[PDB]
Design a protein around this nucleic acid. Structure first.
Lengths: 56, 209, 127, 114, 71, 123
RNA sequence: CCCGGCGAGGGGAGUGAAAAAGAACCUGAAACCGUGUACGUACAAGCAGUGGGAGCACGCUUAGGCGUGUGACUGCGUACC
RNA sequence: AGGACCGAACCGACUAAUGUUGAAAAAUUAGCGGAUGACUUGUGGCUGGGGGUGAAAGGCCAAUCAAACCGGGAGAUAGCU
RNA sequence: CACAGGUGGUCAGGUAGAGAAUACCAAGGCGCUUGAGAGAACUCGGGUGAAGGAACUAGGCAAAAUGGUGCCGUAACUUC
RNA sequence: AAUUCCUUGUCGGGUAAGUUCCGACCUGCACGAAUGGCGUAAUGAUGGCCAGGCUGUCUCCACCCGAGACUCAGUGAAAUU
RNA sequence: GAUGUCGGCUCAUCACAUCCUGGGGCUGAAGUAGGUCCCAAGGGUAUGGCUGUUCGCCAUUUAAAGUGGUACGCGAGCUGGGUUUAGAACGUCGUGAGACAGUUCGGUCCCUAUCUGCCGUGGGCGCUGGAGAACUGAGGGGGGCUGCUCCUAGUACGAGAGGACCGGAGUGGACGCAUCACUGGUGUUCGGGUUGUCAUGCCAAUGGCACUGCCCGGUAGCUAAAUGCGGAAGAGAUAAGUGCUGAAAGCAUCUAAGCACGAAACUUGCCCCGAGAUGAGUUCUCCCUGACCCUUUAAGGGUCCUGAAGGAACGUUGAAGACGACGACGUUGAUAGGCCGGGUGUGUAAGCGCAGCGAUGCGUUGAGCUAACCGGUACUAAUGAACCGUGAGGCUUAACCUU
């Protein structure tokens, strides 16, 4: 549409506050390496239950 | 009298001897395992907690499980409750099943509602879609104006607009039991049951005078 | 709504699905090992395993058959000659999908596809 | 439960003849009515494959006289008296449409031979 | 005395006689009798939340030792 | 018929070619007919030695529907076209003495006593 | 001398009276967005102000009814040109 | 042969769908007509604002046309906001 | 603007087809740079439709339908 | 009537119709002979009416697919105030 | 320094002065029916044409064809036909230029929603120790319509023809809900048929691409055109209205004291959302019973030991759905892809034998290929953890606890 007046700065903050980036609930490191992890995914060197991923 | 928690399981057009078929919906009646019978010993509160079924149930909470523990001890699908009348129930092995529907002519059916995703604008309320020719301005489908003017300066309550289903209850009301079938333990109803297949239902003896 | 379904449609029309899946199913049979998007890796898994099934015992009538469903000369050579006797000892689960992590170029969620009996590999990186 | 899709195979009759499209058949049936039994029979060509669990039926197209009709007689129906296979032709289709309007030499289709 | 409202639906006023309101759910005749005696928004909500009526002759207030008051 | 107007076919000797539904009977605030419905027809054709003439308004009943018509098992006898046997404009029964082409086995009712009382089959 | 894209930017060590003059370098408001602290916000309501005010931090309250800033609650209350 | 015709390339735009804070200075996609003609059209040349130029719309004149652009009169005047 | 806008000349390949229509295509050009996922309303584009056949609307509004080559056959009117 | 205050002329005719269309008639708005009249073949992307085709425009709307919307990452306006 | 139009469509909303059923008085009403006639806003309240049409006429439904208002409801929804409205031109009129609320032809309708409503939906907190499960009803809505005939009922009444209402019932219509077996629809995760060029070195065979090239069939899902089905007996408070008993007026009198009856409306009964109901919820099921220093103190500050039941992220993913929330669940594993048995599609792959010059058919083979559904199968992939949640949980009156 359009708008009535220039809006207050407290309004801008409320509208983007719930859309703000959400917690990871801490992180993981491996049972099986001195490699650091990403949780319930596999690392760049393939360590989780071995095999291999990301041969880049 | 109480209800029977079913499963929507089966749909059949079945034949009769005169060459006429009946579209029917087929519900396996499972037996009730009673839990405790909550009664007015404690407060004025009176109702019966029943589990007609089981689950694999490897992640279930201790608070669900102790209801099944005092129960028929079957790692239950879930808790259904019914108000009661005409004295307390017997708390173990009652097993109300197909014998309930031998004299029930018509049943109500009280679902677990209907599970149709979005519903929303035009589809849920069956309105028209605005003409799709005449070169209408950003419009091959539109619901139509929802209020009037400044004179009231509002939108009245209960108007049909947008939104999801929200999975409430749904009573279809008064559809005929066609047959009840012992040993196979199937209740054939003449009308439809709410939701997709593999969902739960209440199939209860009719509520209305 | 979409109740009582399975599988996935991804990013474009059926001529696109056939030609992308023909690119990728030909790349798998030469390289053994791929990385792709998660939705996409499942559909890739689902295209190649039944072909593997058909090719599980060597057989000319099933090789004529295979040429009729998949008229590609790479896919039918890798089946039967190299890959029939490899998978002769399996009944399903000829390949696995590995949930590999997020994409660096944007953030896209990925999964890797890796033949079942693929088993010697380096654990070092390359650039 | 475990009954779903098994119930199509349980209901399905076993005395049902083997088939391909262009087979002619004949259905003897009742007229059914409100209180009265009369009979009738129907012949023509069967235009399409059946096998539909409980509701499974012989789908004759009559094309004997007058303007065109498809009639669906239910296999699983208690009033259905007799079902002969007769002549067995090849068509290689789910539908027959070019014979809809022609009723002249139309319900007597040939054996297919060598 | 028919307790006028228009919550949002259907052509017409909707209504209830004082007699339905005292014989069934009896609290409400006295409830919407003191309501209009308190001021506007904030102070009028703050005055109201101290009162209870319940249904009638079914009170739980034995243990506090209530001071009797005649009107 | 299903839309307002709708020509469907003469099936008796009262007219020629096609005849037009102007309305459905047996209720109102209706747009579309069921299988068993009684129609109000205008004669858009006529034949000079038929029972009726061009612009006559009469009642009628369904004798074929191209979708098909059903009752006992839900099975259709499904036809190559829609068709309607004209009735009398208030006093019921057909006006025409003959049916042409097939019939259903749904037709055994009080309202078709002109045409099902003939001797060849189906009384 | 440290991190790095063969980069940007800043810190560390040293210059100067001064870099709280570091190169877009003079001293530096107001809009502007962000950091940091105290107190407040889930009997919650319209020119956002006024009149009354629990509470709480800080000033040793010069303890002698005080200062500061804020403030649940709540009478009253319609912008300027 | 043809100010004939169906029709691409080549030109336009009667209509329809779309675009409507556009991919485009009405273009696009699709129906449509012209396309051996009073056509299509490159190159070079010419008239200058109530003035030209118009098989006519008071049309077109550097994205445009019932009055193009700029330097001076000029701080036009306003019984006016 | 790496803007689907606008813009003259020449050269002149294949199969099927009636040719420079038209599907594909040799040589060549070239991916008109957000991507990947879901698959809500709805917005634009594209598919498909029972039964009806504009009944929609002031108005048939593309979208649907007609069409091409050979042959048989052919009206009022007419300046033949 | 490209024309008519009344009127949607009147009457005949097709029809669910009939202001529109087509024939006669005039109880004739303000028609009427180069701002010309009667009539016609061919012609128009030109206008109104007729019967059949065909078709999701509609009766009455269902399901499928893609780009936005919606999900994540990037960059990041505007009408207004 | 602007609220911007007619007719029509969509979507509605409120006043009852009710279109109608329903209750009931009068009647110059015998009964029936009508005229007369009060209550009542609850519910349903039709469609094609011509015209730019409000208004008109006609054909038809319906038991029936209503009344009034909304910036002449509703272009920050939809039209560009109309008239003024740019051009043209008719009719008219004026020396003319140019006009007309007479007129015909097509002709630019804009905005991504800040605050506000509405309906759906998440996050956060009080719920009195916590957690999880079921759940009660302060409070507010859905439905409430209506033809048909059968009984009721040929009966009172009337000279005779004739002749009613509630309740029951089957059945149609609208309206509202759910549904996908049936019948249609579609089904870009399946088969087959088919034009063409291009391709596997060639042929037989088969396939990329041309709208998913076209065309037909299609599993499971979803869906209406198809399916089932509410619209309720009763109750209370009555209205209009018949009253009884009874005063003005020794009686009589719906009224005043007293009291029987009296409609779908209204309070409900049948249906659905609901503890923010701060008055803060109940009931059910589970679980945690180590310690010190101090001040501001039904409390907070610090620290070690130490956190159960539960939670969420995360992860595969669903019979749940914009996003979420909801849900199965991570080897304790059938969550999902393959795969094995089976469903339901389709129509007997290609090769080989054989007739035929072949296209092609036919035995080999009832072939082959097959998606979402069902049950198995660890074959396969969901490393294990960490983390948020903690050590028994208010004041004060009454009751109980040796109290």
């Amino acid at each position: 549409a359009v708008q009535q007046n220039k809006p207050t700065r407290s309004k801008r903050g409320m509208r983007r506050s719930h859309d703000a980036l959400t917690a990871v609930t801490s992180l993981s490191v491996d049972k099986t390496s001195g490699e650091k992890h990403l949780r319930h995914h596999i690392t760049a060197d393939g360590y989780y239950r071995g095999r291999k991923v990301i041969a880049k | 009298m109480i209800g029977l928690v079913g499963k929507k399981v089966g749909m059949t057009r079945i034949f009769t001897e005169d060459g006429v078929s009946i579209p029917v919906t087929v519900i396996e009646v499972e037996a009730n395992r009673v839990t405790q019978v909550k009664d007015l010993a404690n407060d004025g509160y009176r109702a019966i907690q029943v589990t007609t079924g089981a689950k694999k149930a490897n992640r279930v909470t201790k608070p669900e499980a102790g209801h099944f523990a005092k129960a028929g001890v079957e790692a239950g699908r879930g808790l259904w409750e019914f108000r009661l009348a005409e004295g307390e129930e017997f708390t173990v092995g009652q097993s109300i099943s197909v014998e309930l529907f031998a004299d029930v002519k018509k049943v109500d059916v009280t679902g677990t509602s209907k599970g149709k995703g979005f519903a929303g604008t035009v589809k849920r309320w069956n309105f028209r879609t605005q003409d799709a020719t005449h070169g209408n301005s950003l419009s091959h489908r539109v619901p139509g104006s929802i209020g009037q003017n400044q004179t009231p300066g509002k939108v009245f309550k209960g108007k049909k607009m947008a939104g999801q289903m929200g999975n409430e209850r749904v009573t279809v009301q008064s559809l005929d039991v066609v047959r009840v079938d012992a040993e196979r333990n199937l209740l054939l109803v003449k009308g439809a049951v709410p939701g997709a297949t593999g969902s739960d239902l209440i199939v209860k003896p009719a509520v209305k005078a | 709504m979409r109740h009582r379904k399975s599988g996935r449609q991804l990013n474009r029309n059926s001529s696109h699905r056939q030609a992308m899946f023909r690119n990728m199913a030909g790349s798998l049979v030469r390289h053994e090992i791929i990385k792709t998007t998660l939705p996409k890796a499942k559909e890739l898994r689902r295209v190649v395993e039944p072909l593997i099934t058909l090719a599980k015992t060597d057989s000319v009538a099933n090789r004529r058959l295979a040429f009729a469903r998949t008229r590609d000369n790479e896919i039918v050579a890798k089946l039967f000659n190299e890959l029939g006797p490899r998978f002769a000892s399996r009944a399903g689960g000829y390949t696995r999908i590995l949930k590999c992590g997020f994409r660096a170029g944007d953030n896209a969620p990925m999964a890797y596809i890796e033949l079942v009996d693929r088993s010697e590999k380096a654990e070092a990186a390359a650039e | 439960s475990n009954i779903i899709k098994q119930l199509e195979q349980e209901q399905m009759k076993q005395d049902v003849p083997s088939f391909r499209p262009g087979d002619t058949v004949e259905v003897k049936v009742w007229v059914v009515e409100g209180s009265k039994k009369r009979l009738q029979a129907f012949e023509g060509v069967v235009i399409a494959i059946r096998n539909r669990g409980l509701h499974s039926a012989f789908t004759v197209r009559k094309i004997s006289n007058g303007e065109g009709v498809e009639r669906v007689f239910q296999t699983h129906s208690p009033v259905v008296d007799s079902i002969s296979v007769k002549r067995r032709g090849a068509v290689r289709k789910a539908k027959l449409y070019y014979l809809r309007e022609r009723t002249g030499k139309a319900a007597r289709i040939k054996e297919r031979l060598n | 005395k028919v307790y006028y409202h228009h919550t949002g639906h259907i052509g017409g006023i909707k209504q209830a006689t004082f007699e339905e309101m005292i014989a069934r759910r009896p609290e409400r005749v006295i409830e919407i009798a003191v309501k209009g005696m308190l001021p506007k928004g904030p102070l009028g909500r703050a005055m109201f939340r101290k009162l209870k009526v319940y249904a009638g002759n079914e009170h739980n207030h034995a243990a506090q030792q209530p001071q009797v008051l005649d009107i | 018929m299903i839309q307002e107007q709708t020509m469907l076919n003469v099936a008796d000797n009262s007219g020629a070619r096609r005849v037009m539904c102007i309305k459905v009977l047996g209720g109102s605030h209706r747009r579309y007919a069921g299988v068993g419905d009684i129609i109000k027809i205008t004669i858009k054709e006529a034949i000079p030695r038929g029972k009726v003439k061009k612009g006559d308004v009469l009642k009628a009943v369904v004798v074929r529907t191209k979708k098909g018509v059903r009752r006992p098992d839900g099975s259709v006898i499904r036809f190559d076209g829609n068709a309607c046997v004209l009735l009398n404009n208030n006093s019921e029964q057909p006006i025409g003495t003959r049916i042409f082409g097939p019939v259903t086995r749904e037709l055994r009712s009080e309202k078709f006593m002109k045409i099902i009382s003939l001797a060849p089959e189906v009384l």
